[model samples]
Target chain A: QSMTRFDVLTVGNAIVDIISRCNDQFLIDNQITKAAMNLIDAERAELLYSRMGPALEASGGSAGNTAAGVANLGGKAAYFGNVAADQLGDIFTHDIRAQGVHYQTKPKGAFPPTARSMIFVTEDGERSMNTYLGACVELGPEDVEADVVADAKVTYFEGYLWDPPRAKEAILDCARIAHQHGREMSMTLSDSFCVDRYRGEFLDLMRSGKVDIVFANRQEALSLYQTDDFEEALNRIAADCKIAAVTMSENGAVILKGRERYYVNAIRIREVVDTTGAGDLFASGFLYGYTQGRSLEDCGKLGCLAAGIVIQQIGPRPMTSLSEAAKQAGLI
Target chain B: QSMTRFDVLTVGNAIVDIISRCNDQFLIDNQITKAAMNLIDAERAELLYSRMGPALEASGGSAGNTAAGVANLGGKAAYFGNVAADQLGDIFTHDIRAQGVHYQTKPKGAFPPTARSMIFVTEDGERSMNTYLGACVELGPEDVEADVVADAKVTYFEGYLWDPPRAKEAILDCARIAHQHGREMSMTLSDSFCVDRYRGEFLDLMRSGKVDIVFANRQEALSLYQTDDFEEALNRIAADCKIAAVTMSENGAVILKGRERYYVNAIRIREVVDTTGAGDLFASGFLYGYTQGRSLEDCGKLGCLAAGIVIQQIGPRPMTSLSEAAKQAGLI
Candidate 1:
């Protein structure tokens, strides 16, 4: 019924990640919950950043990362996110554009600066995030370009968007326009804690068919369905959405759609470096495969492949082309 | 007489590195000289950054990296560098301060913003740098603190300081105070092209006993004495300063002191991730050992150890504490 010029268009908080390696004791001493995303305020951001070790600043937001990865995998991608008119924003802008992702969100020129996530990566490669939404909180429905959403085959967003008051409205607008144009709407349940914050709203969106696809990790899925059994959570997620992809860390991922089930193993690497963007990267691979009209099993394999590569490195984006990696891994 | 409160004090242009991974073809397309530090104007800086791939931003200036490395190695280190009263400058300030390096150089508040180096790393781990001096050019004799220089056992500066007109005057002032206060004065010939730019002044500083210790790589050493013969260049450098340490990539390093010479083997790593801070980290270890009264051979070993660790990683700053690494490597 409509033209699908882009494979995916992602919308989320536009955050520049400041990543540092620290020991577990540093996490405990700083009152940081290990392997979790914690929302922080401006003062806390300053305090934590002051205490954290020297860091690498890179462009990273859940969906921003996904968009970049999708493009890196040879998919046509677009993105909608919010940042301030600042130096960091310039970096965020350049990275996505250069990565070949379409991004035209205007920079907010108000009091709050660009959003930042202070990500503490430990020796075991687990990352604990402390995020300050900042200008990301300014994303409103007016910022969403209807044409961009309609152009994408899949309009994907992150659950972290629910944290910002106006971004929730923006996401709903995107979902409406995307589906109205016969495009699919998808989202990732960003974190277990994030799931706990808006379980009812997320459930409503999935069950009402407003969001046709949903991505979640083991903990997030467990928290979302309020179940102790993994199978029970998986079944509930599949029942709610047209397609569900649930990640289980090293165990890989499971995809379910209308009595069809597929399981893919995680790619093996010698070491796990920093697991900051595992979930985001997984969605990129899965969506890339799905849009390319590959089998569902291939989609899950691509997801596993992308997540594995990212966890074996420092940042979210792939060090090498995901398309080449997928081909080498025989997933493409 | 001096208190020797700090092991080393480093001075240079304060810069934040925006590092990206690219192919050699991208370098050729952008007219970038491979493995060289190219000085670019603001227009070129913008053009290059806009064209480069997604990057990782980190605090990185030659002497700044050395100061951070010195502190990481359990040395009491202080620094003198110029930055702007801007966002990137805030990152530069916080990183050094958080890394336990005493950095009191005031931030410049004017037209030019903080300095930036767009570093492109090829798949082979070779890095090419394009630098814009920006407010770093604002370094003047007034910015140099007499007490910071005199309280240190060694005052170290990067040769890149000579690029800015006022910075040349500032370096002379620091050298005078350091020698007058009975402190060792050291300098690093930053690049071969850099050596080509200010050969006479650098040679004069060394031969006149203004600089007690000089650090150079094989290329810079060769460039300095204007010879192709390695031994002849080494002999000439030894003739110019009290202590001369010259680095040869992967082949190890040679340290000369009066009639004594020491050769230290490079530490072997499986791969070289990036070569941005090899010389700077080497200076940190050598300066740390010299201040601790270690044998010249031990200092050379420490230098090799530090450089080996940094090149095997992405950024210039040591990911692990160099003190712990030295202890583990049995170098201390």
Candidate 2:
């Protein structure tokens, strides 16, 4: 990806989300978890894509969403993920760039096209995501951007990066370079299952001081610590990583370091329109705050505000001018 | 506010939100902006709140909400806001503490009372707020927790803190101590109008390095720069502060540092039930990520996801276990 003294460089899958509406029974028929993101094969991806009602294609994966939010927040941002030059690829490129991110990872051959996730939204608005990793396989060390890593304040990789075999080395290079350059290394344990798959290694990143920052929700945190007690996991992660951010939905969220922790309460809203891009958007708000050197509390406050704005609308796309929105709210 | 090596120490008004439903005509009759946060006097607060339909009460003000989320996310959180020892005060204190945030500011006498915001939700789900800032007047240096500030990673204050007289000096003491203690200082613009009210001093915070980080939405940014061009204002703030998080709702968010900017694009969502607390929620995610030392991009991503989850519900409170929810989506 391209950048200028990038504020952030995010690495992960580059897949388009093809969101479609469905009933709960459809999830049952497909044996899809009501709200879980399921890893599916090509055959399953096609089967669902073809059978689902009208679908909408949106750009970026978890990292991309982070990139989009970073760029939108006016952080010098770039993305490192893989995609084949295809219709889907074009959309991803256009949208990412349109939102002001620098994304120029080398494209793969057309044989594999791009990666797509079939997001099935049930009546209650819960989404079951089935992703078919396609061009993601093309992401390898060859696509690594050493210069980009050195140029960044922080180089972040999503936990899912390990899924694409080559990405392992590709991401390692960036993380290595970041530390060598005295920059920060951050990563998101994108899923509990991902932690389950990569367990000790994930902890190694934290324990070894390779990852300065880590993002994990309750389940992933629990899985990493192998404990059901939220507080126990909180302390474990706090001691292991320089900082840890964990969310608990309506119950609120927490920010932590070895010696400190901050609590953020979810404010009441009239209603929520969607929940699709809250995490990525949360990252955007947070990354912007971190890069700006805001206190962790302020960063968390900014994050909650950003998440609050995106959820009021159907798409993760913020209809409100969040800056003004936050400004009006006096966050800015 | 109370804490143990506090992750975040926030100060502002302690109020309860009385959310009610009404038609668009009601907003017109009230002369309230569709989505903008409006401050109202006591008489007006009752005029609309009493006339509106049934209402629901929720705990905390902007700063309190941030504290709630931080505590929930496993961050050590404390709050310093004012409230009269009355019914509303009981609710505010009860809810914030219940969420795991430690708050113990000295209560005010009942001559006045706890602050309350009348949030009028229109038919289209837009809210026009009228706030009666009563007990917030009692917040001053008397409420500031010097120990909390010295121990905190960052001491954050809401822009609305200025609304209550004497907060200027109260906030100054904390900011001064935060730096003296080699801790961080963070603040939110909170409102565009607030920028208009104390633009130079706010800028002074950034320019003087008195503030390590600042959170702002578009309107506040524009007002601060006196420019309609978002880009121009973005650069100005970036230059003035170590970090600035600016949000543009539908357009996504932008983060900034000198010589760097990050942009975030909002993702598509199924539907949103509410928009309240999105910003505060966003802050929670960002703060969590930042405290964890995660990359800014990851932090922003966390904020978006947190916001996304809040928007899908009726209240800003997350119905789903956000940690598990984010894990299910592979974004922990």
Candidate 3:
């Protein structure tokens, strides 16, 4: 069935990002990984936040950021995420809706607080995320509105949803609704460790042929296909997936479709302040360009350019006039 | 009865400014005079806010901003302004207290909303403000704490406070407490129109020697003394006030102390965006320098430099590290 409403529908753990800048030694001192997202309990999240310096608050969820980027890039985007009816939750709701995206997920009751990610940016602009899945755990299949998924051209799901028990069911329900109504479904292997935890299920999903597109970074792609050799993993994964977008931080990204493969270079930026939303913005640019009938090469270029802009700023989306910049650069 | 606890205790409206860009024609079409701050009721305020374009929210009130600037410049500042227990009020309270000022004014009951200003910046970077004095109108003499005012070096009041009923009594109460404790009292003729409305009362305050230092822009200074000539106004203003710091916008300012008048040039700025907080920031720099035992000429220089930095951006405060820049520029 042809889509009637949205270009992309994103579902993920709705979260507010409490971002603080820390040094590399602080990471090693706390036994935190250099560039990874670690899921923690409420107590651990509090412990980490207490140690962090002054922070700037912003609305940030993996797929939520992607949805906002799509809307910012002149595309119709809808978002599904959970937050509690607290101060941070109101901020999250306001920020998303203010960007002209469809965000209809009702906030949870005021028992548990909203979910928060204590994102620590190092001197090198790399972010180490420690997430507390607070009220996001309350999102289940019941929160997934069937009509919203059916109306979207593609229902995008973040692999981090697996961390919250009921969220996995919500994603599966969305996927079923999407396919039943003849819409496409996509998934991103959020982190390498996340891939390792859900590798068997991801393989099963890929084998089912229901997932039209799979996005993952280099380490995540390797972990998903169970191969350390990059080429070996690419060769094995290329056969099962209909479309694959593999991102390599500064090196660039590789896109594979059928017998065609395109390698796109990453845009060179003067400084990369924080890479927290690089992949999300990349996905946003690519999806918006693709839905607007751009070529695969153009889509990858758009992704790289968008990633370059986001890495220069503190948050997932640069608040600058991007569409005009894209037009000036002849990317659209 | 000498003062020892604080430098300045300011009392006025507590407002959050929602500033947006508009052209000169838009102001003319709306019947709004440029560089004027007009007080509007709830109905008119809502009407204006509905038609205004997207805006950036910042904490701002005449004396509130001055208090923040003083604190930011390393002065012990105290503020008393009425706010409601709403979200915007929380933001207003947080921003002021976070900047290291003492704010102990109790919020009004939820009868009226928190105060806000719909400030329009024209092409020339001049801001025309229309303020809604919601909870600010509830400020009365009873809200003034005698102990706080008695210990302040200077009890500063803004002309805008006179717009609200019973607020004048609160301002007078602060002035009385300050003078009773042998502390200096200061007042800023906030705007030209504000001075025009309460011209006789303000003149009485100055002539009675209740106000030690008078801070006013060129228009306000000229209006208060009822003179067209700058020199004529300065001569008359100096006879009543101990010091008169008359800011002349781009020409910098004039410091009149007895017969010695020092003409200070405006600090060079790269570009001028919105001149919303030029005067407030100037007051901050001068007060900061004055409290730090700088010469009158150096204080004027500090004022000019601070105004130059703030006029380059949309808000009143300079985003640049002012303390370092001021020291480097030899103002500190």
Candidate 4:
């Protein structure tokens, strides 16, 4: 039997997030949705950045953050994504590796610059993202390492990968390789808009049993089912997939697995500074617990704990030690 | 008479700050001094960064932060510094310009990568900085735009600029131009260690009347005068320069002009998040108020208010509008 080298292997766009705090009026003036991720071209990225306030840059991407979270929680994690051979790319590599995640993807030399997301967090703690997928588009099936995917307990991918044509194929290839090795495959609907863009394909992936685990927040879950009713969306996801974890912001999360249901309450946070990486970190905690053979309720609790820690900080990744946090919460 | 396009022009080494929170033990393990700026070579920078916790990158430099603060306080500010033609360089350029600061220094293509300072904020809100002066060393007398310096109401320089061989010449050249144009010259003793490094020259500059306005905190003020007694340092600075603003953390500040003295209390802060840019923003607020012909006490109050606002957040620049803060504090 092949030894599992990693608890999780995540594949998605490698991005540096430039986060700034602004008021709701600024969002309305810029014609941006309050709390949504919008894909922008290079020009639009420049325009939006020019009009935004001073920001802090941190290495961030849906799956990238999840991988960092897993590593921070003391789980062995690996990440596969593309960044140009630039300073920001160097930073992206350094930050993930610093978090104890194995990141071996070679930086692209002749592609566009490293991907970046300008995240504007309003006073209400909601973030509106404008992402420019530059070198992320360079990731293709050839970039997927079969050995890595096969050695992971769960191979996770982000729905944002669909936006980049070649990255989509790369994620699918890794998912297939994971399944071929009898490893579970998981995917997070990165954003509701992302779900809206790939509804049919996502449904096919879940129903066809290609994705053994699915992660989604309320909006993404509802968008995936094309229903406004929360229960209806939950029921559809439960019937469609073998396992599903649905996050409901402050209401906490619900986990469904083979007719078993677990409802976890959200951990109380002193204040919500920025809600940029809550869902991504939640996936990290849940997947780490699942890989460790914990109960579904324990996994959900860990997930909520992780989500609470990230929401109180400005960046998408955990500023505090998540392993210590998990231990304090008695989830580990 | 020439029209003054900028209220203040700040010259210093351009840097991006990678700030992270760590315990005092981390500093001991790394052999780093707490609450001090240490210059590190490229290799050491890499080694320290590799061992650090996850960090947030933002445009920061002693004078760069001051320039951003001035702009944020509704003053016309300009900055002169050097960064390589790289992604971080682009970010540095974009951020300063976004803050309404006119930044016209061209990126150095043949020099090393952009400079960066890795700042570690301990639990008590004190920060330890390790700076790698990369492309910043390329800045020389030629980079100082004579017209820009001559037209400013005050040309501000950071004492840390003395570290880079060429940056020292650049700052001196700006000071001469400011004096020749009958504009005021301001200088900040960037750190107590920095004062220790060039005590003779700093004393000479102040005594020679090359720098008309001086900014320093308690430690730096004492170090500059080579004394343990605060009163002794205050007495020496009163006789040395035309204007001196000395900050004493929560104890408030003392402003000395010839024989005139103004004591202003420090603004009360709810929480101290990071003190990386406190001194820089303090300079910004005081310079902004001084250029607007405000009273000496009002300038000191504005400075304290600006410093208090930045300490409650991460990074070196003001997270809130300094103009709004000054207005709310009744200093504007």
Candidate 5:
């Protein structure tokens, strides 16, 4: 039998986030939907960037942020994603490895530049993301190492991976490998717009039992189930997956396990600077709690606390004394 | 006679600043002097950067910040510096041009990476700068266009230019062009350490009547005149340079023109985020006011106002309505 390796392994479009703080007028001027994620081509990315003010670049990907959060919280995490062998790729690799996570995926020397998400965070901490999936499209089934997936306790994937046509195949292959090795497979509905793009395939993946845990934000969960009421959507989603954790920003979250349902309130936030990484960091806390043998209710609480801290700062990850907080709160 | 084609033409190392916030312990751990500028080699820069947290990249150099500030304040500004044809270089170029400054130097396609400075700002607004002069060392007399320097009303040069052997020649060439065209020449004792590096040459430049306006912070002025007392240093510096604007952090600033002197108080700042570009932006405001025919006291107040706003932000430049603030205060 393969030795137990990583507690959590994340697969997604490895990207560097170019975050910029702009007022509400900028969103209206750019015709961007506030609190929504949009996919943009290289030309549009360049055009928009030229018009925008100065930006702050940080290493961020949907599941990649979760992996970093897990590593920050003292969890053994592994990550697989795609970036060209470029300057930004070097930065993305250094940031992940520096945080003590396992990141061994070699950059494709001949691929396009590293993927980048142009995130505009408004005063209310709402973020509108426009991603340019440069080299992420290069990730396919061939890139998924069976040994890594098999060794992980949970193989987690980001729904944004569906946008890159071949990335979906790679995620599915990794999920299959995890289940074959008797490991749980999990996935996050990365964003509402992402769900709107891949609702059918995502439902199929959930119904086929390929995903044991489904993580989603309110809009994402609502869109995926094609229901107007969040309650009805949560009930339907709970039947499709072993567990469903749906986040509702400030309203906290709802966790459903069979007929049992728990409503978790959000931890008190000091200030909300940028809401870019709330859901991703929430997954990190929940996954960490899960792997550490915490109760399902405690896992949801951990997720809320983790998400709360990140929202109070810029970017998608919080770098405070998180591990200490987890231990002090008796969740670890 | 040459028309006043530019209000201020500034020369310095062209670099992209990567700013990060840290606690006081970070300064102690790094063994870095607070509010001091240190020049690092490529290897050392990489080492220091590895120890720093994720950063926010901004286009900044001592005089580059001044140039951008002047342009932002409605001055006809031009810049001369060196940067490689890399992504950071592209950002540097785009930023200055977008701010309405004349930037004609082409980035070297096959040279070392663009220069980058890692600025660490503590909670108290004290900043420590570590600069890597990558392609900045390649700047030579060839990069200084004759008409650009001669047509400017005032030519500004940063003392840090002395670190790069060829940049000194470029500044000297611009100084000669400014003199031949009967335009004013200016210089900033960039930092205390930089002043120590080229004290003999800087003294000669001032004594020869080639430099008109000499801008310096308290530390730099003290280092230049080899005196510990701010008043004594002010007297010695004023005797040589045509005009001396000496800034003393919270204590405000003193402007000396011939025998007449004006002591301007610091503007009240509610909070100070980073003190990285306070002096540079002060120079920008002062020079902008001087070129626009404002009084000596009004110019000093404008400088204090600009410095005040920059200190309350994270990066070198303020993105808010600074000119409007100046107009409201009746300085512009």
Candidate 6:
């Protein structure tokens, strides 16, 4: 890659997270799909929020979290997303930028407001998300700054971008720009349902070499490969992508590079408060290590460390300085 | 007091709290008053938000926290405040109502957004608040439902209501209706500065019998009486109000009723996380116990217990059930 200013640039919809605790029964009563990201309209977002418990709000979109993670890990990270010029939008903009990530996306006008995900965390530390795309849908190719994509060692995209028609084009443009600048491209299968919705396109993207690295949790990997067999799913992903990281909750994660494979154990957590941003942070740590020329083993270890820290808290972002934590973990 | 539907009805600005942690230097750099509530315009709100760190948002105005605390203690609580008909406003309305607090105030359209307080928590757990009274300013006497006020055992008001012009009339109207229906009226000297701003009017309210109960902390008590002598402040408050609860941090609290006096030790906590809603929740517990015909000592103990629980967490409201915590503390 040419001389770059950022380690990673992430592209996708921007969203603020409103997280609350609810019991398993509340999910059933509300007809909400457990541990899945469900796209809801503005009206449904309002209705669901009214019925949910008192919440804590933080800046959180799939790619946004990853960008924040990279920044927290002391990486030069840049973000591309859209938010309306409203209170929540201002919050979304402020929070992401405050993390030391470069965020220069212009805020949209008053129309749809900012996107938000009503995250319901259950007793088991699982989160069920109901997202409203809102102003995130306004993200188009025009928002993709070629200089930003070219100025990052890696350009990352979230699979959830498929939900917003224009956002998909923006990410594709970002990926193309990154490749044109000789930078690596990465993507995360944000949710199993998201993968299920765009399985064909995702497969085509990997096969066509549009995405160099892929991040997926076990459920998403399984959904993508359409198999109950974990080994079969791992084999399919390895064959499809140059590099793939598949996470399996507490069992840790599996990193595959062509025929070579490595397994890293999950970092032990004192308590798992909420698992909202584990995958995103894992990708963050891995990408940071990759751009910094760390071994795949060290990268996986750092990924586990970052994921562990975020899952120990309620919000999607780490409460403590991730770079300092990384130093303590001896990963950097 | 006549038969009532609610144990307590709290009136104040409706706000969602955007809380962040900062070093003491940030406060100095921003010119924010430490441990005080500073009212800011919309422009300042935007400016400060942009400059602050990532924050957690929750439904938390002074009176809002008390209403949530009352409901958490299994009391029938109602809240009177204004919010805009926007996303954050919906979140504010939903959260308060979800806590089982009766929230019937209608949301305003377009003009101003919902009120929000950018709370900065220092290392010592003390909070400095920058509040924007947006839609909260729309609250007027016309919004006060006389039936709702008359149906509560105690109509509680926060002195911060004085920040917004029309909210003052709304609260005064609420007090009148409560008195006409033979209900007790309670008010909190929200902050030392707030007491300084309206000391004469507050004194008149207490002396003229418009406010039957008054809640104040050490600084506010001192400011109200304009004396550093604690004994003098206590005596002045005792003479002006029928019932007074004065808090003195870890030194505990003193309650006065007629010629009788009661003292309660502060509840021991594992740690103090944020002191934003300490006084508000203290009022909540006291009112809940007072309406249940508890003794002054028990009411003060409950107040201390509730305050202790809130200050151990980030947000103003209780994370655990206050009723359950009260039972554990054997206050009930």
Identify the leading candidate in terms of lDDT.
1
In model 1, how large is the Cα lDDT of residue B297? Answer: 87
lDDT of 5 by residue, A1-332 (tens): 64588889999899888877788999999998889888899999998888766666778998888998888888889999988887678778877776777888877774578998889888887899988999998998878888889899999998888888798888878878898889999999988888998899899999999999999988998898788998889889999899999899899998899998988999888788788899999999999888878888988988988898888877776757578888887776
Q: What are the per-residue Cα lDDT tens digits for candidate 1 across B1-332?
A: 44567899999989999998888999999899899999999999998988888888999999999999999999999998899987899999999998999988887594599999999999899999999999998899999888888788999999999898799888889889988888889999999999999999999999898899999999999999899999999988998899999999899999998878999999888898999999999999999999999998899999999999999889989888789889998976
TM-score of chain A of each: 0.98, 0.95, 0.97, 0.98, 0.97, 0.98
lDDT of 3 at A50: 57
Task: Tell me which of candidates 4 and 5 scores higher on DockQ.
Answer: 4
Worst 10 residues of 1 chain B by lDDT: B1-10
Write the candidate numbers in order of decreasing lDDT. Answer: 1, 4, 6, 5, 3, 2
Residues B1-332, model 3: lDDT tens digits: 44367787888789888776787888988887789998888899867766665345677897887888787777889999999886567667766776778889888685587898888998788899999989998999988989989888778888888888998888777777888888888888999899999999888888888788889998998898778998888898888799889899989999989999989999888877889888888888888777677899988998888888889876665544678778789766
Interface RMSD of 3: 5.4
Comparing only chain B with the true structure, the TM-scores of all models are 0.98, 0.94, 0.96, 0.98, 0.97, 0.98
Q: List CA RMSD, all candidates.
A: 1.4, 26.4, 4.4, 1.8, 2.7, 1.7
Docking class of 3: incorrect
Best by TM-score: 1
Which is superior by lDDT, 2 or 6? Answer: 6
Per DockQ, what order, best first? 1, 4, 6, 5, 3, 2
| lDDT by residue for model 2 (B189-280), tens | 88777788888888888899988888888888999989999889988889999878787765667778787777876545666556777777
- Model 6, A54-128: lDDT tens digits are 888899998899999999899999999999988788888888999999999998697788998999999999999
What is every candidate's C-alpha DockQ against the true complex, given to 2 decimals?
0.86, 0.01, 0.13, 0.77, 0.40, 0.74
Which structure is stronger by DockQ: 2 or 6?
6
- Determine the iRMS, in angstroms, of model 1: 0.8
lDDT of 1 by residue, A136-204 (tens): 989999899998998899999999988998998988888889888889999999999999999999999
On a 0 to 1 DockQ scale, where is model 4?
Answer: 0.77
Clashing pairs in 6: none
Which 10 residues in a row give candidate 2 chain B its minimum summed lDDT? B49-58
Error of 4 at B83 (Å): 1.5
Number of the predicted model whose DockQ against the real structure is largest: 1
